[PDB]
């Protein structure tokens, strides 16, 4: 029924778009390593692993 085909084609298009969005950003991991780039991301990484270890209230007061 026409509604099924319209729904199918919407779902298929959007799931391909999602898979493409995720997959096109992997080039850097495939070429070298699953490691953090640039200078600024390292502060976000250190602070993130802090919050992941010490808990919110000790990160906020940190």
């Amino acid at each position: 029924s026409y509604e099924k085909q319209d729904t199918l084609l919407k779902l298929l298009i959007l799931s391909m778009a999602a898979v493409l969005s995720f997959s096109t950003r992997l080039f850097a991991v495939l070429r070298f390593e699953s490691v953090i780039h640039e200078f600024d991301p390292y502060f976000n990484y250190r602070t993130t692993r802090f919050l992941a270890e010490e808990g919110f209230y000790k990160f906020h007061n940190w």
């Binding site: 319209d6 919407k10 298929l12 391909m16 493409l20 997959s23 080039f27 495939l30």
Partner: protein, 37 residues
């Protein structure tokens, strides 16, 4: 491991398939009677 060339090909093919499918969707839309009643 998969190389960045095999990924580049895969992504090119996904892109082409996506845009061709959207250009099909516009036909499946305009042919609809209920969209224009």
């Amino acid at each position: 491991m998969i190389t960045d060339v095999q990924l580049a090909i895969f992504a090119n093919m996904l892109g082409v398939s996506l845009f061709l499918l959207v250009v099909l969707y516009h036909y499946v839309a305009v042919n609809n009677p209920k969209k224009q009643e």
